[PDB]
Design a protein around this nucleic acid. Structure first.
Ligand SMILES: [Mg+2]
Ligand SMILES: [Mg+2]
Ligand SMILES: [Mg+2]
Ligand SMILES: [Mg+2]
Ligand SMILES: [Mg+2]
Ligand SMILES: [Mg+2]
Ligand SMILES: [Mg+2]
Ligand SMILES: [Mg+2]
Ligand SMILES: [Mg+2]
Ligand SMILES: [Mg+2]
Ligand SMILES: [Mg+2]
Ligand SMILES: [Mg+2]
Ligand SMILES: [Mg+2]
Ligand SMILES: [Mg+2]
Ligand SMILES: [Mg+2]
Ligand SMILES: [Mg+2]
Ligand SMILES: [Mg+2]
Ligand SMILES: [Mg+2]
Ligand SMILES: [Mg+2]
Ligand SMILES: [Mg+2]
Ligand SMILES: [Mg+2]
Ligand SMILES: [Mg+2]
Ligand SMILES: [Mg+2]
Ligand SMILES: [Mg+2]
Ligand SMILES: [Mg+2]
Ligand SMILES: [Mg+2]
Ligand SMILES: [Mg+2]
Ligand SMILES: [Mg+2]
Ligand SMILES: [Mg+2]
Ligand SMILES: [Mg+2]
Ligand SMILES: [Mg+2]
Ligand SMILES: [Mg+2]
Ligand SMILES: [Mg+2]
Ligand SMILES: [Mg+2]
Ligand SMILES: [Mg+2]
Ligand SMILES: [Mg+2]
Ligand SMILES: [Mg+2]
Ligand SMILES: [Mg+2]
Ligand SMILES: [Mg+2]
Ligand SMILES: [Mg+2]
Ligand SMILES: [Mg+2]
Ligand SMILES: [Mg+2]
Ligand SMILES: [Mg+2]
Ligand SMILES: [Mg+2]
Ligand SMILES: [Mg+2]
Ligand SMILES: [Mg+2]
Ligand SMILES: [Mg+2]
Ligand SMILES: [Mg+2]
Ligand SMILES: [Mg+2]
Ligand SMILES: [Mg+2]
Ligand SMILES: [Mg+2]
Ligand SMILES: [Mg+2]
Ligand SMILES: [Mg+2]
Ligand SMILES: [Mg+2]
Ligand SMILES: [Mg+2]
Ligand SMILES: [Mg+2]
Ligand SMILES: [Mg+2]
Ligand SMILES: [Mg+2]
Ligand SMILES: [Mg+2]
Ligand SMILES: [Mg+2]
Ligand SMILES: [Mg+2]
Ligand SMILES: [Mg+2]
Ligand SMILES: [Mg+2]
Ligand SMILES: [Mg+2]
Ligand SMILES: [Mg+2]
Ligand SMILES: [Mg+2]
Ligand SMILES: [Mg+2]
Ligand SMILES: [Mg+2]
Ligand SMILES: [Mg+2]
Ligand SMILES: [Mg+2]
Ligand SMILES: [Mg+2]
Ligand SMILES: [Mg+2]
Ligand SMILES: [Mg+2]
Ligand SMILES: [Mg+2]
Ligand SMILES: [Mg+2]
Ligand SMILES: [Mg+2]
Ligand SMILES: [Mg+2]
Ligand SMILES: [Mg+2]
Ligand SMILES: [Mg+2]
Ligand SMILES: [Mg+2]
Ligand SMILES: [Mg+2]
Ligand SMILES: [Mg+2]
Ligand SMILES: [Mg+2]
Ligand SMILES: [Zn+2]
Lengths: 83, 239, 52, 50
RNA sequence: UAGGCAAAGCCGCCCGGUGGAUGGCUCGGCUCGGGCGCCGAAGAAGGGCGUGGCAAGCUGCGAUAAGCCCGGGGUAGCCGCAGGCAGGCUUAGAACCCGGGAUCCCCGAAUGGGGCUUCCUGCCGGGGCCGAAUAGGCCCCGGCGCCCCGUAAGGGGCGGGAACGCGGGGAAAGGAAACAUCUUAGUACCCGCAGGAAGGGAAGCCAACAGGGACCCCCUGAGUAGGGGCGACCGAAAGGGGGAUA
RNA sequence: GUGGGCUGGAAUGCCCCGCCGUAGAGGGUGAUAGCCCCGUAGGCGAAACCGCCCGUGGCGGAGUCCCGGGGUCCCGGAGUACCUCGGCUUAGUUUUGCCGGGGGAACGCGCCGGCCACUGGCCGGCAAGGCUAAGCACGUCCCGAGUCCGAUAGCGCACUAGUACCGUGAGGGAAAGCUGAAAAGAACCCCGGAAGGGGGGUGAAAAGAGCCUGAAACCGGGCGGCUACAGUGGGGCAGGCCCGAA
RNA sequence: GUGAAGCGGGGCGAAAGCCCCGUGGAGGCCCGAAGGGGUUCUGAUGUGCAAAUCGUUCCCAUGACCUGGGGCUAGGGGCAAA
RNA sequence: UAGUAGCAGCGAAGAGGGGUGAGAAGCCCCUCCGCCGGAAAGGACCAGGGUUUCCUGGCAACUUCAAUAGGCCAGGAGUUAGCCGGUCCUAAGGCGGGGCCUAAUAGGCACCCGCCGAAAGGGAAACGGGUUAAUAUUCCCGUGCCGCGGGGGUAGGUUCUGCGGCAACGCAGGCCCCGUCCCCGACGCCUCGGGAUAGGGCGGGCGGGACUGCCGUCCCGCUUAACCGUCGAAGGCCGGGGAGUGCCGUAAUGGCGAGAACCGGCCGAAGGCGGGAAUAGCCGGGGGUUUCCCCGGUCCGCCCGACUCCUGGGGCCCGUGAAAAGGGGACGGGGAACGAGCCCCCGCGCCCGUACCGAGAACCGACGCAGGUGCUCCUGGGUGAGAAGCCCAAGGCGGCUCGGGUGACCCCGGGCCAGGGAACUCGGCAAAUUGGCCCCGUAACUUCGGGAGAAGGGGUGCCUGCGGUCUUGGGGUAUACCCCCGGGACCGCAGGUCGCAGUGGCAAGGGGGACCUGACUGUUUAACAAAAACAUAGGUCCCCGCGAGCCCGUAAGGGUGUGUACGGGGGCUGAAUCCUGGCCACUGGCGGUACGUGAACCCCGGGUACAACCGGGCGAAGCGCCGCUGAAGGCCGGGGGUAACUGACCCUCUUAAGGUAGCCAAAUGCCUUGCCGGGUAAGUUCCGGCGUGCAUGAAUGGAUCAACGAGGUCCCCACUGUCCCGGCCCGGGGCCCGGCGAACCCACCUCCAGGUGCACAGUCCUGGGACCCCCGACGGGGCGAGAAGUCCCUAUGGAGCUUCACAGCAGCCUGUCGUUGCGGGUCCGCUUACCCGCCGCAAGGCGGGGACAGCGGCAGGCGGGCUGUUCGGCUGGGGCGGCACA
């Protein structure tokens, strides 16, 4: 509780209630978005802010989806097609 | 008490131990790597003396090696007896041609590599005795040694050379490096001590010690330990 | 500082808690045995002949 | 402490239950011989080693 | 001049306050003599928590909780220390004492697994509850330690006990008028292992040409032989008399 | 014997008179009790549990038992006996026992011992496998006794003591007994905010729950002597004031 | 507060090349609160507020920095910028 | 002692009236006064405490005074969770079993297996309002969320596949089981751009409040939770385009045929807005009565803006800033005929914590203790650079738990002081001076960075106007510019004017020169030493190729080591710059042909019916001997004479050589206040020189001061109560009164002089004095008190340290016995022993070494690494000396 709030792991949000008071709500920070397995950059269509685990996310309509980006997928497909 | 610092070091205290949890793993050759591999990462390792390459073999085995100077991400390395002696390739010492600069040399096959593992270091393949399956190599110290011809080495020199030429300008820089290494930092001179704590400690005008024999027991074996000589005359006699 | 000012730091720590076997305030929470009866490191009761 | 374990809480409850002087009818029954109790204590003075 | 005549203060006696000596008392201690002598997985000892109408501690007991059942003794009182207030139990035989049973929380060798809180938690089988449900969930009960013996069934060890016993490891202080060999001392202490005792015990013995006849313990042999900076000091055995007798 | 009288709050005491005694060990009861009571000498006793002794009973074995002769064939305990080196120990000393390193037998025609070793004689035995009652140690505990202590003693603890309590912990650890025969535990009146005070009661006695006795130090008051021009305590002599009942 | 590397413009040259300004934001850098420390008065206190304190004056204050919780090292041993 | 000390000091404090009550300065209420307000003080809360919380009653005890008060006493009561924490995960690490080790265990742990390990890390899901004396994300109302499971509808499926877009990617995207892979979880520090929100303010409006000497101003309310939807800045990406006379930019670095400008599109924060939701809450106005009902309002336009939240850019690292649970996706295999991540509906969510303090009275320190823990996290307005100080909100407090009188001395803290200005003093100790900001200006020297705020000089208030540079919105053709309007910030100019004083209070550097010393920042003797001591970067030497070197363990084994010479370990020096001289005699280390010596074993001879026993031989290391080694410990004189102190001469002694470059009366020079100059009227200190230097000198570091200094020292200016020299004042002690109420010390208790005496008498002698008692003060005496003197010595007393003491034990080295076997001729070979590493759960396999090594026993050497001891006596005190020790 109190040392858990003294640590900076949660966001300190000040909010004014309908009762006229000002309170501090301790809210979670967002989880990191999925990254490409080769470049490490965030994947398009999956970089929305998520604050808890267990939320199903819809991958882009492509082979390998939210695993690799379109650049890596296209280049790998070209290499496999030639090879 | 009375036990000296070099005697206290052997107990394995936290201030003398190496924090190897800060590293991803040992930099050794796995026993049965063969074929072609891909250099996927070049990383800094805390407490080590060279950048470390992560090699992803064609069959999926991944291992850590010391990065040859000039090695780059996405490079294709060859492992095995059929590998050409190009930089980054892992070859047997028996196959490696004479005069070649190798590193991470294995004294016996399968130990993972022992010699020429610091940044900017290398071993030189001097000769090959195939009738006793041995390879004569010169180590970084200048010493000439025989190694198992079936052992493995990497072609090139270890990256990161020249790291020690730049001075450690502040005590804080050496402090931060020591925190990643195993060194106890800093060190008190022996003659700055009292007689209970060091053989050199004591007198009103404190002095160092003359050399002790090689048979001296622990706690007495400090300073020069069975030295052939000392000073500029010793260096001259060595050369 | 070793006297009264250092006495103020003994307000929140602990070395021992109550032992489940012998009930004394002698169970070392870090060493995980009782300093009185030896529970947690010896299944036989700890009692020495030099103690009255 | 705000956060307690149940065993420590139960030992504290035992101390709270025992902390009380003998009843007045017990004093009258013993003819003023039993006046005090060994389990009587003050929270600021005598400290439980719970 | 002295008395009437006295401040603060000093000495002695008496009375009072304080104090708890003295004396008297004793359900306590201590010593000695005799007996008796093991408990524990059928879960012990020890601890925590609880338990009384008013009950804090001690004592007892264990959610059936100063207590329940059975039998014998004991008859009219009883509800412990503990002299109060109530209300009860008991002549349908209580209380009390002795023998036998029932109950016997949690921790504890603790033994399903954990245990930084004497509390928490898992899997399997059976049962119960919430629920529309046969889902899901929750709760109750039982089993689940290690190492062994045994074909299996099944069984054994574990921990405790005031002292005593057996095997092992094993000091120093002090003494020697210093001190090292020595002694202290195979002691203090530590590790392990038993029993009501343990260990020992039935001649490859002792003797000396005469003969004893397993063993232990007691008296003696005896501070003798002997060991020893031959100093301090240490120190038998055979033999004899007994306890007992295999 | 609870008999007569006396003292006494109350007799077990005193004077007088009786009785038992295998019992006059000891304790209690309103003061000191052989005969008031518990007890003592002595005797009787267990549904249940436990222990010991005796008689009897059921069963199994390959004659394994006793006596006589024959034998000279077979068996008779190994890293053991023994030697050497180091060490601990022992009275064990050129000679105790053992542990470790190294070496290492024989077989009853043999092997072992008889205070250095070997040789011969003589004597005594059969190691290197296992058990064994009785007679002996101890004291948590039970019983008895005492030229033991008697609440600062005796165990640290006569008591809601291994307690309250102290230390993080290993550990350490006190102080503290007594109304009276019976609560008859102080009615009632006046005062006080109350603790409480006065009066009045109970009691043989306040012995008043702060409770037997109740010392000294200490403090208050009364009394006697001195007390502001005279330097202190102790002794002797003379005197002033005060006490001088036993 | 200072203003490192780096970067723009202006002036001056035939050039090689110098100067001025700005931008930039380095550092066991500087002044200074919190915080850490403990120099002077040899102040106060010194049967204390306290078995080491208080006032004043001071030192560091982006780092070999200060600080919470958990952990390891044990006595002839630990730990020690000593 | 003594009704005495203390109940002061650390920057708050009380007063009037009333009530209660036996009793009131102190309890309760109002009014006045004061204190905090980035906090010894307001909000939250960890550990610890454990009922101190709330209510009722009370004052025998407790609170440094009182009490009717209370954290006290007595009685009663109080802590409600699927969504807040634990619980789960792993970290550093730890424990258990198996195994190995061990005389043994309750001792050890590399191995294998399991588990524990965070109430600040990772991590499922709840918010707003109301309610109680005391719980409040827990109770109630309202509105939701998560996990697990089920039902209906639906999209979808039912051999086979979902649909659209060039694409980035979008969209309900069927069901069940299993596997694999990837990603999230998952990460430093510094810096600067952008976007928000909390909070704050300004003008107007409505409602309410404050004041009555004048004006009419001043204050308060006007709020919006979680959750659902939608939007989305930076950034990234897709399609078109095809660019070098370039073109496009930033706060800054800058970008482009390796694909720019430009056009369109995709993914995409905090947060906004709507719903929630005005029906709540709040402000105001009424009615009832036990907290309910009714009415009005809850608005308009702007501005600032975080330390809170989000986002991106750049830089630094010999420093790279955790893991796992859990979750998401994808890629495959298998199965059924059904069926969802969408909509509606149903069910379940166990166990433990939850009061209160959280500290100048609830923790620790014996205390209701000026300390420590925790100021750990948060906080409005003015001034202001400021989270500084000062004043005031919200909120709290007058309880750092004695009150009154007096206005002596004296003490603690504070203010001023004429003339002089360090004459004080060991010493400018202390105090004083300066002080902010702007402008001008700034030396020697230097490692070129610095020195530097060097130094030195000038300005500074208020008022009335005139401008400028931006910013933020709105309106104008109008995205920049331009004009108008509202708000914000900073900068400047002109004039007028007051004072002793304009950074007017608060806040707030004195400065300069020279020597020594340590380069610097940093660390140190908790409780007398902060330093020149330690460390430091830099330099250098040594042991080491890894089966190493060094170290720990009885051993199993372990650390360095998840390592590898640009490395691990061990010494010395201590930035940089110029340098680092000669010497291997000694003490060590190391290497070596031969020779002497050199233990056990072994062999030979004698002896012994056998042995004991005696003699000899062989002979390892080591020692002797011979060399190397000084950035090993370290040393560095002379004798002389000759000779123009000697430039030169021969050398010799010499423990080896004979002090080089340098530097000096030094923190090193006795003599010694050395001699010569400077400084002062006067200088034992200081500075600059001189140097046969008692007794300077080179990594034992020499010389050396740029920068730095709570270092030590000398001088100059300024300044001043340091002083001539003392005075006056302020607060608190003080004194007096009321209340509480100790301690130290105490044989008894003592007027003075001169003597005497165990030699320094209150008590003895001879004198001189004194009416007794009480108060205040002081510190001459009572050899005043505190503490069995630490100084000295003795003791056949210790401890620690040293080594060339007496002994001993580990450790290392060496020989030998055993392990040690098989061949071939003391030698060569072999592998199965044994050892070393790899794979493997194990079984076993691979490679290397190899009867060597390692290991056990014995023996020798080195061996203060470690253990035990001894270091005599006499003595004009002990010691040196001497032996008066026979
Ligand atoms: Mg957390
Ligand atoms: Mg986080
Ligand atoms: Mg370290
Ligand atoms: Mg020192
Ligand atoms: Mg030495
Ligand atoms: Mg030493
Ligand atoms: Mg020395
Ligand atoms: Mg200490
Ligand atoms: Mg601890
Ligand atoms: Mg306390
Ligand atoms: Mg008088
Ligand atoms: Mg029990
Ligand atoms: Mg268990
Ligand atoms: Mg046993
Ligand atoms: Mg003795
Ligand atoms: Mg002696
Ligand atoms: Mg002695
Ligand atoms: Mg027996
Ligand atoms: Mg026996
Ligand atoms: Mg003996
Ligand atoms: Mg009778
Ligand atoms: Mg035999
Ligand atoms: Mg008495
Ligand atoms: Mg006693
Ligand atoms: Mg009395
Ligand atoms: Mg008379
Ligand atoms: Mg700094
Ligand atoms: Mg001082
Ligand atoms: Mg002082
Ligand atoms: Mg004082
Ligand atoms: Mg500073
Ligand atoms: Mg007074
Ligand atoms: Mg006073
Ligand atoms: Mg103030
Ligand atoms: Mg104020
Ligand atoms: Mg606070
Ligand atoms: Mg209260
Ligand atoms: Mg109250
Ligand atoms: Mg209370
Ligand atoms: Mg866990
Ligand atoms: Mg509350
Ligand atoms: Mg307004
Ligand atoms: Mg900028
Ligand atoms: Mg609360
Ligand atoms: Mg106080
Ligand atoms: Mg402030
Ligand atoms: Mg207020
Ligand atoms: Mg006050
Ligand atoms: Mg006063
Ligand atoms: Mg003046
Ligand atoms: Mg002067
Ligand atoms: Mg003078
Ligand atoms: Mg000063
Ligand atoms: Mg000021
Ligand atoms: Mg320094
Ligand atoms: Mg410093
Ligand atoms: Mg100190
Ligand atoms: Mg100091
Ligand atoms: Mg130094
Ligand atoms: Mg240097
Ligand atoms: Mg040296
Ligand atoms: Mg030299
Ligand atoms: Mg010279
Ligand atoms: Mg000088
Ligand atoms: Mg000189
Ligand atoms: Mg010299
Ligand atoms: Mg020196
Ligand atoms: Mg020298
Ligand atoms: Mg130097
Ligand atoms: Mg110098
Ligand atoms: Mg005299
Ligand atoms: Mg005297
Ligand atoms: Mg003395
Ligand atoms: Mg002394
Ligand atoms: Mg001395
Ligand atoms: Mg003597
Ligand atoms: Mg010692
Ligand atoms: Mg060998
Ligand atoms: Mg050996
Ligand atoms: Mg020694
Ligand atoms: Mg001697
Ligand atoms: Mg002498
Ligand atoms: Mg002498
Ligand atoms: Zn215990």
């Amino acid at each position: 509780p109190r040392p858990a709030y003294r640590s900076r792991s949660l966001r300190r949000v000040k909010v004014k209630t309908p009762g006229g008071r000002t309170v501090v709500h301790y809210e979670k920070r967002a989880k990191g978005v999925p990254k490409c397995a080769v470049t490490g950059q965030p994947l398009g269509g999956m970089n929305s802010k998520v604050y808890r685990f267990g939320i199903s996310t819809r991958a882009p309509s492509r082979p390998y989806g939210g695993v690799v980006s379109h650049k890596v997928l296209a280049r790998a497909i070209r290499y496999a097609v030639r090879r | 008490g009375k036990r000296i610092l070099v005697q206290r070091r052997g107990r394995g205290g936290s201030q003398f131990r190496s924090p190897s949890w800060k590293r991803d793993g040992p930099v050794r050759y796995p026993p049965n790597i063969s074929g072609r591999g891909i250099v996927v990462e070049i990383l800094h390792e805390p407490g080590l003396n060279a950048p470390v390459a992560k090699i992803r073999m064609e069959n999926g085995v991944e291992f850590f090696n010391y990065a040859a100077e000039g090695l780059y991400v996405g490079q294709v390395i060859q492992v095995g007896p059929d590998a050409p002696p190009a930089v980054g390739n892992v070859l047997p010492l028996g196959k490696i041609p004479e005069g070649t600069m190798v590193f991470n040399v294995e004294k016996r096959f399968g130990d993972g590599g022992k010699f020429a593992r610091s940044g900017g270091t290398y071993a030189l393949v001097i000769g090959q005795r195939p009738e006793e399956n041995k390879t004569i190599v010169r180590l970084p110290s200048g010493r000439v040694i025989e190694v198992d011809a079936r052992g493995r080495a990497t072609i090139g020199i270890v990256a990161g050379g020249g790291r020690v030429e730049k001075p450690f300008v502040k005590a804080g820089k050496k402090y931060h490096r020591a925190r990643a290494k195993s060194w106890k930092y800093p060190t008190v001179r022996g003659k700055a001590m009292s007689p209970y704590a060091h053989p050199h400690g004591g007198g009103s005008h404190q002095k160092g010690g003359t050399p002790v024999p090689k048979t001296a027991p622990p706690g007495q074996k400090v300073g020069f330990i069975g030295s052939r000589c000392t000073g500029r005359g010793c260096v001259r006699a060595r050369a | 500082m070793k006297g009264t000012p250092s006495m103020g730091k003994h307000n929140k720590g602990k070395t021992h808690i109550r032992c489940p076997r012998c009930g004394r305030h002698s169970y070392n929470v870090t060493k995980k045995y009782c300093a009185s009866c030896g529970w947690g490191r010896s299944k036989r009761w700890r009692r020495y002949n030099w103690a009255k | 402490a705000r956060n307690k374990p149940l065993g420590k809480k139960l030992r504290l409850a035992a101390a709270l239950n025992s902390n009380r002087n003998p009843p007045l009818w017990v004093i009258a029954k013993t003819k003023r011989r039993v006046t005090r109790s060994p389990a009587r204590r003050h929270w600021r003075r005598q400290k439980l080693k719970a």
